[PDB]
RNA sequence: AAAUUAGAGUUUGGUGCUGGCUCAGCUUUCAUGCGCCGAGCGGUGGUUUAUACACAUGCGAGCUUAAGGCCACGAGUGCGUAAUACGCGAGUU
RNA sequence: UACGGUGAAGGUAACCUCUAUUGUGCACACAUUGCCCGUCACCUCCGAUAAUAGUAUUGUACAGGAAGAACUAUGGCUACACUUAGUCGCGGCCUGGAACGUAUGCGUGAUAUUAGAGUUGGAGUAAGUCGUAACAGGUUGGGGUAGGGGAACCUGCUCCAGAGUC
RNA sequence: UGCUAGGUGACCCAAUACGGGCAUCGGGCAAAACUCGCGUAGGAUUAGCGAGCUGGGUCGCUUUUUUUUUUCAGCGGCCCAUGGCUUAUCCUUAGCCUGUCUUAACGGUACUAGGCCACGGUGGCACUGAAAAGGGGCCACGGUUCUUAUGAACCCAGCAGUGUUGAAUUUUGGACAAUCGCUUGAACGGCGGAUCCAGAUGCUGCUUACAAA
RNA sequence: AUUGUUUGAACACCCCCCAAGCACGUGCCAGAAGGGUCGGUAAAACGUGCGGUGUCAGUAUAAAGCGUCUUGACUAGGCAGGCAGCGCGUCUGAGCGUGUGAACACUUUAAACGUUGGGUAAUAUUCGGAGGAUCGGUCAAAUGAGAAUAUUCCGGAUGGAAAGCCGAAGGCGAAAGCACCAACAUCAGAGUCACUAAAGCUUCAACGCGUAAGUUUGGGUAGCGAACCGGAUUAGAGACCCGGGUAGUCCAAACCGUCAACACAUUAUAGUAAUCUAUAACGCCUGGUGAUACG
């Protein structure tokens, strides 16, 4: 019709998580095991995890469950759920695998 | 006898817009936990999805009257290629 | 607390107020102690950028230039067949040179890659902090182009009224 | 050119009687190979194409073979007409189409099987063949081993299987019986990791309490 | 043909979306969540038991593709008003095209455009005279003109700015814009009356116009008004305001070309001045913060 619209229509098939790189689960080595204080109106000290991942890039990961056993040089499996209460963090450490196993009496 | 269009929550003192996020849909993985692994008949499906990475070992093209006669079909992958490609349509020296 | 005896002074200009009535503006509703501003401050996070250590690919200057080799060859060697016994051989097989043709070397270009010296920006963050941009909003602001200041910024000149309001 | 049937043999094999191979001829249909008409990812932070970049003549372009008639191309050498394109070139992504999933449809996007192309660790090249190379030939590269170091041998994008990476990837199974292919004139012959059957493993459709005839 | 009786086991969820609720536990701690979020001492979300809903040898989480999403709109968004009309024009692209567009003769139009000559209310400086302490200025205060004569006032010179009223919800323009005349001058636009029989529409690309600032060149300059020094509401004050005033505003030539350059109303045709809207070519947007750095 209008030929500008005729040329007006393959884009970037954008992975909405750009750290798993299209995959669901990538393992990695925990660089640092640390906690932080969250955005108000939350004030409970949430425990996080900076991981050197499989793809050579780094992003922060939520640590779930009643405590954990992760230290330096420790391998985990990282999942794709985010934690909302601090900005910019999109990763969840799944439990039922490696040095991070399940809590006692869940 | 032609078989053909689902929304909701989220913004604000409330109302309506404005577009975005999410959940409920279908399909999909030797995905990841937790649980069973009774036995049979089957369909099928893995692009070892990636590495066109390095391959131990064994086998995959030998047949036949020393000599000669026949073994370019099958299998795998997508490096390269944006066009002697591939598809469609006409005519062939 | 109650009940009488006497008993006057004294009054309308936003002249504050405490409203209403209202009908002109807000980005306020925790309803102007708001919404919310930035220089910065400790840190965290993808940028953007890059001297370079360079490796991966190609054009071009020439040496080359292997295996091959377009061309060139009659040095051949042999039968077919024809010569009644050396002839003959249009035609089949064989030492020969060679343009060209990789990989390759010091020059010297392209696209591409991360390593990264090193600088700066965006964003994120509960309590370090200096002033009033913004709103009747207190100098009426700004699209524009240049100046001046520890900071928010202001100085001109046409516009737009998408600030109030008679 | 390649297959199948015929017809021929001053050939070879078999034959208590006759058919095969082997050479040649020709009927049938056939592949192959080329050509052009169109389609086709984005990028101006690719704007001129560093080029014969297109055309005309001349040759070279390695065979005559049934009646009136018959045989491509810049592919190379030479002149020559000076033009040809302008999403032209250049970059980077990417095998392509049908498919499969979804949508009500138009569309949008990982497979099924299968169509075609490309490639065989990298690059160059040739023989033969009508047509060229995935376990054929030669050289150079890059790997892997060994040498008394001088040099040789090999290249799983074939099957199983090993190792890295990965969240994840299977049995070093059986078999020529069925196809189908190659081959052989006996012999239900020989071989085939094609395939057919079994495994592990996602999805599925479909049963499942024992006893007894 | 023969005979006996029967519903497992888990996983997730149970505030709303979304079917399902209570107890103790701990009280912005341990925690969960896809979103709104709940916990800040009486938790219908988090520790556990009970009870219930979904699916069932499966179930939830994670991802990925499509749809929902008209969320790139052809079916099917739009673009003053959230985000979206390029500042305007010339324009043989492509596309849409059976009376529009253009030149002539009259009627009528003015701030349309450039050049040349002349003028002006008014302006500060100056040459002599009147006159002897105020003027300037502001809500208010403060450097100075001035004991050499200030505001003023007389009359004279200077030299260029700007066109003071007209003059207005008035005109001309494509837009920016355009406001002393007189003349040259080149248009333009409207109406009448005639020619012409699509030469029409749009503008990708290109290209011009382009208020004002700013820079190069030449000078000199009524008024205007950045620096530099002086004083003020206030604690510092660099601003608002008072006080002198340089480049620039003035001219002639060039470069720049960007902007709430707005009808924020694309252009054109067809209807009665559109934001009533069918179409023709367009240009632009795709949640916010992030447009700055390279080329």
mmCIF file of N, CA and C (backbone and C1' of nucleotides) in Angstrom, chain B residues 27-52:
data_model
loop_
_atom_site.group_PDB
_atom_site.id
_atom_site.type_symbol
_atom_site.label_atom_id
_atom_site.label_comp_id
_atom_site.label_asym_id
_atom_site.label_seq_id
_atom_site.Cartn_x
_atom_site.Cartn_y
_atom_site.Cartn_z
ATOM 1 P P U B 27 -0.541 -29.768 24.891
ATOM 2 O "O5'" U B 27 0.866 -29.439 24.221
ATOM 3 C "C5'" U B 27 1.070 -29.654 22.815
ATOM 4 C "C4'" U B 27 2.366 -29.035 22.346
ATOM 5 C "C3'" U B 27 3.637 -29.577 22.980
ATOM 6 O "O3'" U B 27 4.066 -30.768 22.337
ATOM 7 C "C1'" U B 27 3.739 -27.202 22.828
ATOM 8 P P U B 28 4.858 -31.887 23.160
ATOM 9 O "O5'" U B 28 6.257 -31.205 23.497
ATOM 10 C "C5'" U B 28 7.248 -31.031 22.470
ATOM 11 C "C4'" U B 28 8.399 -30.183 22.959
ATOM 12 C "C3'" U B 28 9.168 -30.722 24.154
ATOM 13 O "O3'" U B 28 10.179 -31.622 23.720
ATOM 14 C "C1'" U B 28 8.757 -28.384 24.409
ATOM 15 P P U B 29 9.910 -33.198 23.732
ATOM 16 O "O5'" U B 29 11.201 -33.766 24.466
ATOM 17 C "C5'" U B 29 11.647 -33.153 25.680
ATOM 18 C "C4'" U B 29 13.017 -32.555 25.501
ATOM 19 C "C3'" U B 29 14.085 -33.138 26.409
ATOM 20 O "O3'" U B 29 15.379 -33.086 25.821
ATOM 21 C "C1'" U B 29 13.644 -30.896 27.037
ATOM 22 P P C B 30 16.438 -34.243 26.161
ATOM 23 O "O5'" C B 30 16.961 -33.843 27.615
ATOM 24 C "C5'" C B 30 17.965 -34.610 28.305
ATOM 25 C "C4'" C B 30 17.328 -35.729 29.094
ATOM 26 C "C3'" C B 30 17.947 -36.048 30.449
ATOM 27 O "O3'" C B 30 16.922 -36.392 31.370
ATOM 28 C "C1'" C B 30 17.985 -37.983 29.077
ATOM 29 P P A B 31 16.259 -35.263 32.296
ATOM 30 O "O5'" A B 31 17.124 -33.968 31.968
ATOM 31 C "C5'" A B 31 16.506 -32.828 31.366
ATOM 32 C "C4'" A B 31 17.136 -31.565 31.877
ATOM 33 C "C3'" A B 31 17.037 -31.389 33.387
ATOM 34 O "O3'" A B 31 18.176 -31.930 34.048
ATOM 35 C "C1'" A B 31 16.130 -29.493 32.316
ATOM 36 P P U B 32 17.990 -33.000 35.235
ATOM 37 O "O5'" U B 32 18.607 -32.279 36.516
ATOM 38 C "C5'" U B 32 18.946 -30.880 36.507
ATOM 39 C "C4'" U B 32 18.347 -30.184 37.706
ATOM 40 C "C3'" U B 32 17.724 -31.096 38.750
ATOM 41 O "O3'" U B 32 18.676 -31.684 39.614
ATOM 42 C "C1'" U B 32 16.236 -29.328 38.277
ATOM 43 P P G B 33 18.357 -33.103 40.239
ATOM 44 O "O5'" G B 33 18.154 -32.793 41.794
ATOM 45 C "C5'" G B 33 16.962 -33.297 42.427
ATOM 46 C "C4'" G B 33 16.201 -32.148 43.034
ATOM 47 C "C3'" G B 33 15.266 -32.532 44.179
ATOM 48 O "O3'" G B 33 15.980 -32.561 45.405
ATOM 49 C "C1'" G B 33 14.117 -31.130 42.646
ATOM 50 P P C B 34 15.928 -33.862 46.315
ATOM 51 O "O5'" C B 34 14.458 -34.406 46.049
ATOM 52 C "C5'" C B 34 13.910 -35.459 46.845
ATOM 53 C "C4'" C B 34 12.425 -35.267 46.991
ATOM 54 C "C3'" C B 34 11.609 -36.533 46.835
ATOM 55 O "O3'" C B 34 11.593 -37.356 47.988
ATOM 56 C "C1'" C B 34 10.639 -34.868 45.493
ATOM 57 P P G B 35 11.880 -38.907 47.819
ATOM 58 O "O5'" G B 35 10.716 -39.420 46.843
ATOM 59 C "C5'" G B 35 9.388 -39.568 47.385
ATOM 60 C "C4'" G B 35 8.559 -40.455 46.488
ATOM 61 C "C3'" G B 35 9.249 -41.708 45.940
ATOM 62 O "O3'" G B 35 9.246 -42.755 46.901
ATOM 63 C "C1'" G B 35 8.036 -40.618 44.211
ATOM 64 P P C B 36 9.787 -44.226 46.533
ATOM 65 O "O5'" C B 36 8.481 -44.987 46.030
ATOM 66 C "C5'" C B 36 8.610 -46.206 45.288
ATOM 67 C "C4'" C B 36 7.644 -46.242 44.130
ATOM 68 C "C3'" C B 36 8.044 -47.161 42.984
ATOM 69 O "O3'" C B 36 7.572 -48.489 43.192
ATOM 70 C "C1'" C B 36 7.375 -45.030 42.145
ATOM 71 P P C B 37 8.522 -49.632 43.820
ATOM 72 O "O5'" C B 37 8.946 -50.482 42.545
ATOM 73 C "C5'" C B 37 10.101 -50.078 41.802
ATOM 74 C "C4'" C B 37 9.682 -49.542 40.460
ATOM 75 C "C3'" C B 37 10.181 -50.352 39.269
ATOM 76 O "O3'" C B 37 9.209 -50.350 38.236
ATOM 77 C "C1'" C B 37 10.986 -48.146 39.107
ATOM 78 P P G B 38 7.887 -51.249 38.341
ATOM 79 O "O5'" G B 38 8.253 -52.443 39.363
ATOM 80 C "C5'" G B 38 8.808 -53.666 38.834
ATOM 81 C "C4'" G B 38 7.748 -54.728 38.691
ATOM 82 C "C3'" G B 38 7.479 -55.178 37.257
ATOM 83 O "O3'" G B 38 8.474 -56.058 36.753
ATOM 84 C "C1'" G B 38 5.429 -54.871 38.389
ATOM 85 P P A B 39 9.397 -55.571 35.536
ATOM 86 O "O5'" A B 39 8.753 -56.275 34.261
ATOM 87 C "C5'" A B 39 8.481 -57.682 34.250
ATOM 88 C "C4'" A B 39 7.308 -57.969 33.348
ATOM 89 C "C3'" A B 39 7.329 -57.246 32.006
ATOM 90 O "O3'" A B 39 8.109 -57.908 31.026
ATOM 91 C "C1'" A B 39 5.246 -56.887 33.026
ATOM 92 P P G B 40 8.680 -57.072 29.800
ATOM 93 O "O5'" G B 40 7.530 -57.155 28.703
ATOM 94 C "C5'" G B 40 7.026 -58.451 28.345
ATOM 95 C "C4'" G B 40 5.717 -58.300 27.612
ATOM 96 C "C3'" G B 40 5.743 -57.363 26.406
ATOM 97 O "O3'" G B 40 6.292 -57.967 25.247
ATOM 98 C "C1'" G B 40 3.883 -56.844 27.734
ATOM 99 P P C B 41 7.009 -57.031 24.177
ATOM 100 O "O5'" C B 41 5.807 -56.560 23.247
ATOM 101 C "C5'" C B 41 4.912 -57.521 22.669
ATOM 102 C "C4'" C B 41 3.684 -56.840 22.122
ATOM 103 C "C3'" C B 41 3.941 -55.657 21.207
ATOM 104 O "O3'" C B 41 4.361 -56.019 19.897
ATOM 105 C "C1'" C B 41 2.302 -55.054 22.777
ATOM 106 P P G B 42 5.881 -55.775 19.476
ATOM 107 O "O5'" G B 42 5.843 -54.409 18.641
ATOM 108 C "C5'" G B 42 5.942 -53.176 19.387
ATOM 109 C "C4'" G B 42 4.756 -52.310 19.051
ATOM 110 C "C3'" G B 42 5.080 -50.991 18.347
ATOM 111 O "O3'" G B 42 5.217 -51.189 16.948
ATOM 112 C "C1'" G B 42 3.610 -50.584 20.145
ATOM 113 P P G B 43 6.294 -50.353 16.130
ATOM 114 O "O5'" G B 43 5.413 -49.239 15.389
ATOM 115 C "C5'" G B 43 5.871 -47.874 15.440
ATOM 116 C "C4'" G B 43 4.770 -46.985 15.961
ATOM 117 C "C3'" G B 43 5.041 -45.486 15.823
ATOM 118 O "O3'" G B 43 4.673 -44.990 14.544
ATOM 119 C "C1'" G B 43 4.349 -45.966 18.039
ATOM 120 P P U B 44 5.811 -44.809 13.443
ATOM 121 O "O5'" U B 44 7.134 -45.029 14.307
ATOM 122 C "C5'" U B 44 8.172 -44.042 14.411
ATOM 123 C "C4'" U B 44 7.774 -42.903 15.323
ATOM 124 C "C3'" U B 44 8.898 -41.945 15.665
ATOM 125 O "O3'" U B 44 9.453 -41.229 14.549
ATOM 126 C "C1'" U B 44 7.717 -42.424 17.637
ATOM 127 P P G B 45 8.909 -39.815 14.016
ATOM 128 O "O5'" G B 45 9.543 -38.748 15.021
ATOM 129 C "C5'" G B 45 10.913 -38.934 15.395
ATOM 130 C "C4'" G B 45 11.170 -38.268 16.722
ATOM 131 C "C3'" G B 45 12.641 -38.025 17.055
ATOM 132 O "O3'" G B 45 13.161 -36.877 16.398
ATOM 133 C "C1'" G B 45 11.555 -38.949 18.932
ATOM 134 P P G B 46 14.239 -37.033 15.226
ATOM 135 O "O5'" G B 46 15.534 -37.646 15.940
ATOM 136 C "C5'" G B 46 16.534 -36.742 16.427
ATOM 137 C "C4'" G B 46 16.117 -36.219 17.776
ATOM 138 C "C3'" G B 46 17.203 -35.479 18.558
ATOM 139 O "O3'" G B 46 16.637 -34.399 19.292
ATOM 140 C "C1'" G B 46 16.520 -37.408 19.761
ATOM 141 P P U B 47 16.003 -33.109 18.538
ATOM 142 O "O5'" U B 47 16.721 -33.067 17.113
ATOM 143 C "C5'" U B 47 17.896 -32.268 16.877
ATOM 144 C "C4'" U B 47 19.033 -33.155 16.425
ATOM 145 C "C3'" U B 47 20.426 -32.750 16.899
ATOM 146 O "O3'" U B 47 21.152 -33.921 17.263
ATOM 147 C "C1'" U B 47 20.408 -32.959 14.543
ATOM 148 P P U B 48 20.991 -34.592 18.723
ATOM 149 O "O5'" U B 48 22.379 -34.266 19.428
ATOM 150 C "C5'" U B 48 23.029 -35.224 20.272
ATOM 151 C "C4'" U B 48 24.350 -34.663 20.737
ATOM 152 C "C3'" U B 48 25.417 -34.488 19.657
ATOM 153 O "O3'" U B 48 25.989 -33.190 19.762
ATOM 154 C "C1'" U B 48 26.310 -35.675 21.493
ATOM 155 P P U B 49 25.679 -32.105 18.616
ATOM 156 O "O5'" U B 49 25.034 -30.876 19.400
ATOM 157 C "C5'" U B 49 23.855 -31.055 20.196
ATOM 158 C "C4'" U B 49 22.621 -30.575 19.466
ATOM 159 C "C3'" U B 49 22.445 -29.063 19.409
ATOM 160 O "O3'" U B 49 21.866 -28.660 18.177
ATOM 161 C "C1'" U B 49 20.649 -30.029 20.618
ATOM 162 P P A B 50 22.631 -27.596 17.254
ATOM 163 O "O5'" A B 50 23.797 -27.059 18.199
ATOM 164 C "C5'" A B 50 25.182 -27.259 17.861
ATOM 165 C "C4'" A B 50 26.085 -26.533 18.833
ATOM 166 C "C3'" A B 50 27.524 -27.048 18.900
ATOM 167 O "O3'" A B 50 28.425 -25.947 18.950
ATOM 168 C "C1'" A B 50 26.553 -27.092 21.061
ATOM 169 P P U B 51 28.747 -25.103 17.615
ATOM 170 O "O5'" U B 51 30.337 -25.142 17.505
ATOM 171 C "C5'" U B 51 31.137 -25.853 18.461
ATOM 172 C "C4'" U B 51 31.852 -27.016 17.817
ATOM 173 C "C3'" U B 51 31.007 -28.262 17.600
ATOM 174 O "O3'" U B 51 31.474 -28.990 16.469
ATOM 175 C "C1'" U B 51 32.675 -28.706 19.236
ATOM 176 P P A B 52 30.663 -28.909 15.089
ATOM 177 O "O5'" A B 52 31.568 -29.715 14.053
ATOM 178 C "C5'" A B 52 32.956 -29.982 14.317
ATOM 179 C "C4'" A B 52 33.862 -29.315 13.304
ATOM 180 C "C3'" A B 52 33.944 -27.791 13.364
ATOM 181 O "O3'" A B 52 35.254 -27.371 12.986
ATOM 182 C "C1'" A B 52 33.179 -28.464 11.232
#
